[PDB]
Amino acid sequence: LLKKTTGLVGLAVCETPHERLKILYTKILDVLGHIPKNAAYRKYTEQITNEKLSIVKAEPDVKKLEEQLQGGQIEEVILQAENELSLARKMIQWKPWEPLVEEPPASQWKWPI
Amino acid sequence: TRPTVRPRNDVAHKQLSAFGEYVAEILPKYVQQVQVSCFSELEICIHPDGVIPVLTFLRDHSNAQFKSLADLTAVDIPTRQNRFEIVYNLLSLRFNSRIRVKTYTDELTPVESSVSVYKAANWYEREIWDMFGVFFANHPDLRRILTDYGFEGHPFRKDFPLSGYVELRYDDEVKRVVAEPVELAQEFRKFDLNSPWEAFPAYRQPPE
Amino acid sequence: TSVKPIFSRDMNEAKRRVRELYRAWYREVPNTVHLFQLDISVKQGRDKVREMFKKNAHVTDPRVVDLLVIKGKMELEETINVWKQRTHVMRFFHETEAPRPKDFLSKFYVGHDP
Amino acid sequence: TYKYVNLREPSMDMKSVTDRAAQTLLWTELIRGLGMTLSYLFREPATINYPFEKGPLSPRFRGEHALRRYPSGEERCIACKLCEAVCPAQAITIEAEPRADGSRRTTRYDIDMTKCIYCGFCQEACPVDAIVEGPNFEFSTETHEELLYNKEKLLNNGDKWEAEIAANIQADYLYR
Amino acid sequence: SNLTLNFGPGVLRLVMELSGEMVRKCDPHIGLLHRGTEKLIEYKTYLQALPYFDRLDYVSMMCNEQAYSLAVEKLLNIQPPPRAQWIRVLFGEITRLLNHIMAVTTHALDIGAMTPFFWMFEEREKMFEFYERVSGARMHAAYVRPGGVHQDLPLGLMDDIYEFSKNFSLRIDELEEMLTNNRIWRNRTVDIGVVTAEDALNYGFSGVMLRGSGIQWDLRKTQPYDVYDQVEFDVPIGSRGDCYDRYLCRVEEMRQSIRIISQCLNKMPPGEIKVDDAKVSPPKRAEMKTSMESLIHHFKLYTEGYQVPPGATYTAIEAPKGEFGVYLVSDGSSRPYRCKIKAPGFAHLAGLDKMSKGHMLADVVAIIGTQDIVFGEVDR
Amino acid sequence: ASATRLIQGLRNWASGRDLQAKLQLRYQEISKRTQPPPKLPVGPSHRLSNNYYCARDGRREAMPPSIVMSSQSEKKAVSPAPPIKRWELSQDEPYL
Amino acid sequence: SNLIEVFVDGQSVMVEPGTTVLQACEKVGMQIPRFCYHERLSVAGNCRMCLVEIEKAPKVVAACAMPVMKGWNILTNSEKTKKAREGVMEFLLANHPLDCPICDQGGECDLQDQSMMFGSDRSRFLEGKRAVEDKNIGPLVKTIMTRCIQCTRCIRFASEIAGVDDLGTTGRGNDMQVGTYIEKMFMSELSGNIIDICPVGALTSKPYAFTARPWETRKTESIDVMDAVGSNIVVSTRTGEVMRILPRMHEDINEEWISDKTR
Amino acid sequence: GVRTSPTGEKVTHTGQVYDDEDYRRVRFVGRQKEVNENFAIDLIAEQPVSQVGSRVISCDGGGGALGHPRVYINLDKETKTGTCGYCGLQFRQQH
Amino acid sequence: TQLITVDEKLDITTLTGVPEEHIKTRKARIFVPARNNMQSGVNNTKKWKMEFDTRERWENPLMGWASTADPLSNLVLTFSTKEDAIAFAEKNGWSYDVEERKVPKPKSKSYGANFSWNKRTRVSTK
């Protein structure tokens, strides 16, 4: 129907939201395959990305895709997919599935003192 | 317990406990404690090396989306060897939720600045420099924001006194506002208000 | 005993940063006396800079002298940019403050302070 | 549950384009603003004639402090120091002793009116309605220490304003 | 090279780096009203700490009272009575009218439109009469307290609030006649201070500063407090993120505040106004002077104060300037261990440097107007 | 209220509104400055029986925060709450 | 060892045989409310504020007097313990005078404090109160006996520590009055400690009377020099002026008492 | 019941007067020492002793909730009257 | 490596902004506060406190108020253990003195001892 505005300032209307979400979700899965399988970030993000990708592949309509992705406008769903891709690329470098780097001191989180 | 007692929200308590488990198992490298208060607020107590990886997670993960930095706070607790408790209050508008991320430092260990995650932090941790003396590494313009320009000390430290060490007056000899050691015409009257009877048995600490 | 540094790995890099901060203050003192139109000399302001550096001369911790260099750079940034007024520059010179009793006997005469 | 301020697309027929061109060239909204200013020119202004006319106040009004008495001349203050305990500014300084008939009475009741935040926590903490924050607000001074009230000043304020203070308390004590 | 203008000492210091007419850098120096409020709070009881909140956003007094009261009541695990909650929502929206009159009319006064200032401050004087009739003070009421409100409404106050509210929309209409369609007012606001939605979220903006950019967020709707889920109102949403849509959002929030005030006047319930836990709220003076327990509780609440159970909350409201938060830490005693005050104007004035880039020097006073900045809450 | 009808008509024409119906100056329509005395109600804890304070003690039902994780399968990924419901446009006045 | 195992709120603790319920709860850091119990006086068991539930026992026990049996689970925070405390506090405050603003005990009053902590927040007493004739026991102890809650710490102190046997209870029932029954002057060398151990404002310091108030006093821990005992004291000052002298607990010197010269 | 020191300075109801050699009298030079001349210790002595036929009397200071907390005064001593600790009104059992 | 080894004593006195007179002439006192003997409650004897030596309080010439020139006259710090207080005092260059915690020793209480057959611990009244 070619939505005129997203309503959010600085968030332009995406012309082809379905193909853009398919590209972003397969790119998230490609980046996310470089994480070990036992990492919870990989399991959880593959789970939610496969759910969103199946919803995108199942719905031709743009408005109904917005109501069942449940993330607002379709352009901020695209923006969140970009943020998840950037996050996964950072999580490869951080490697935060590793064990805890240091225990806190024994009364560090004791409240009240 | 209906009229005068605050009603407990068990649904939000269960949801925030599940999301705290979620954050603790996605990021076990930095998460030290996860707790949910009885009024249903989630606290993620982390190691200070994970200021940037945890906050970037909560900002960017599709199940978190904590896009708003509501507040950034230090708390001085002098009985801890890491006396400063750095507190991040985050708002997810997508999931209509708030989270608290807590870490710690002493006087000499720098905390990594989170301006690359939230630009909102730019003044807040700058305030934490001014009020508490916590240095933030890789901050763009870290300097004082609230105290006077030549101010010595960090006022919100609990060993800093209520009235300071200096006070100002106009001196007409030097034609200038001058700083002198503080003398009060009336001393602030310290009130010892604490009852010697225990108020809350649920918060009783185990004895020695 | 393994702590995280601020800028300096040891005391030599720390003394390097102290030394560069002293160079910058030494260069800045004549401009500070000029544009704040101070009633002190350049020699007197440089003596005050030397006094403030020698006051902290006993410190052997690299993180503490890193924070001292950071705070000295903040004071210098507040001086070069006209963020301080003349009053803040002259607060280093405690001119309206009467000299404190130094020896035992005059402190005995004036009051109870040790 | 939300509305869009400023999401109107203007009509592009020749009627509306000519309307906007006439507004641009003939200054129509400017004449509208001049009409509204001219409309207030012919209204009666809201100006009261101070000091002959006064701004309206309630009997709850928090003004100048006063120490009150019983209807026998005995002062109400029994030196309990609740008002200085609750005083958020620590504006109240109290010293007390038994006086010559053994009564628990103050020897010092100071209110620094320049520390005072005029919030009335002292009059609501007072168990005997001794300290009140009365109705006077016209007590500006020429010197700072004239606003450092001792017990004699506060008892004279009570004796000065009691005919008004008692009637204001009479109008409001059932809300307290 | 480029010009450096030090606009010296609400009160604000500004360090401008200008390149002719354009603004290259805006450095706001603050702390000119830093009073160390939240260090003073640590040496006072919770009741004693309450009047500091009147003096932070000093055009939004009872809203900050409400935020601090909600924080303390959350840590105390008690709830106010329903009439207290309706009085808090009524006076919170009266307070919102006060703040948006202050915001819009001083923002017009700083641009040059000086007359609707004088028109709307008489309405503001009548609302200060409402504060004075309910508490005894025109501005710093100390009225909304942890546990409810201090004192019940005097008889005849709701009729006068009705008589104010019945006429106030015409005052908004003539303000809007002076400014909204005025081409001079539009030239000073329409392309000025454009904030994208993502930058407004990232820079910690809240309130109208989000809603002017199209972000559908209002804490009275999303995270509702006292009885805001029982009142019906709309949330004005901007479309261009500029000074003009934020102006229109504040005008329409005055409209919706009048709507909420009508609903509060019609739905005010009977009952008590403090929580009937006398270990938190002080008893009535007639029973204080009659009952032994009531006198003991009066004594201890006005000298020690109530003990708050240990813990930390972040309690936020939709104040008229945005999200007003208290991060309150109790150690178990009757005094706050820590009270961090989150003000909207702090992050808004931090975002002033991005908002002023590419604009003129006369646009900066308009951007400092559209960010509703009171330096009491900015500096604490 | 004391304005003559010529000035009143000029004023209503210049504003474009009926100004006498909604005057910004207050008159006899406001409440009396002397009111009858109130009789304020009491709360729910003003009872002579079944009113033990331990059955209504709010501060003593506050608990320490439940430690979810401490450092001393195919489970579903969770969010801190369900996603926020999309706001509906105003039926009252959408400006559409 | 012959230690027996008891339970305070489920927590195990090993106590000596003959340990009371109150002392067993003290070993896990729980202070049971009390008025007549004092750990340096003999056990009276008559204020009934220490009543606590032992589980699987359908009657509260006086924790100051009851020895623990092996295997008791002491329920310090259960519902009927709290109801017992609220009922006993209600009876203590039924006839107690509304004197807290004019009473010197206010702010440092056990009755005020554990009325706040363990009692109800309001009154059901719709009657007139008793009023007791004041006694004259000397120039040191001001006596306002309407405030007396009849805990008999007076009498046990004067009998057991001061060795005087001049205080007692005359009468019977609600008319039972603590006093000397005659115009007799209680002037021991240790007579000022009944000001300390009186939990209420019935026995106050006549020199300290009306002058200060405990929240505004600064507490300086110091030493007596009035003799060679070296009694540990608190000098309580206010705005740079010495208000009074209280004892400090030193178990090996002055256990928690001071002489009247010291005081 | 105000009186006057030999310096000419009025003595307050507390009993405060500066000494003759005290410099702080200079604050009243050209100005006045504000004293209240309604001494409460003299005005409560002017009240007559209330003769009542009860053994215990109650006083709230008059006005109900406008007075002080209601206290109960024993009147068993016939040597001394029973004085209210708040308002200073004194009572006597008439038998 | 990203961690350095500092074997020096922890000293932050040059960073706290405290003037030298209120570092080297003050005596911090580290102590568990004594129980107010007006009351039997012991909840104020649970934590360690750090206070400083009381300096001069004099009479204000105008009002008679207590004037002070001591900035540290109201500074009372709370610590969970003695060692935390000692570490905080040594970190700030404060010369300190520590009083040990005085606990009340366990008493032997027997209500039956009030009514003994042959001991002096009989009460003469009850």
Ligand SMILES: CCCCCCCCCCCCCCCCCC(=O)OC[C@H](COP(=O)([O-])OCC[N+](C)(C)C)OC(=O)CCCCCCCCCCCCCCCCC
């Ligand atoms: C003796 C009395 C003298 C004064 C008379 C007026 C008194 C009252 C004045 C009240 C207002 C004062 C406001 C002060 C500020 C003014 C600002 C302002 O208006 O700026 C000017 C504004 C500026 O408009 P703007 O820039 O705001 O509007 C946007 C315009 N675009 C989109 C193009 C960028 O208007 C003008 O420039 C108009 C100039 C005057 C034109 C006069 C009418 C000419 C009509 C000719 C006939 C046309 C017929 C159609 C075509 C066919 C022709 C054959």
Ligand code: SF4
């Ligand atoms: S009004 Fe408030 S600040 Fe003023 S004396 Fe009373 S309690 Fe203190």
Ligand code: SF4
């Ligand atoms: S609260 Fe009232 S009675 Fe108590 S000291 Fe203050 S003024 Fe006097």
Ligand code: SF4
């Ligand atoms: S003894 Fe305690 S409860 Fe009784 S009047 Fe005195 S302070 Fe109040």
Ligand code: SF4
């Ligand atoms: S006067 Fe005090 S110590 Fe003596 S029995 Fe009565 S309440 Fe107990």
Ligand code: FES
């Ligand atoms: S304490 Fe056991 S009954 Fe008094």
Ligand SMILES: [K+]
């Ligand atoms: K006593």
Ligand SMILES: [Zn+2]
């Ligand atoms: Zn009386």
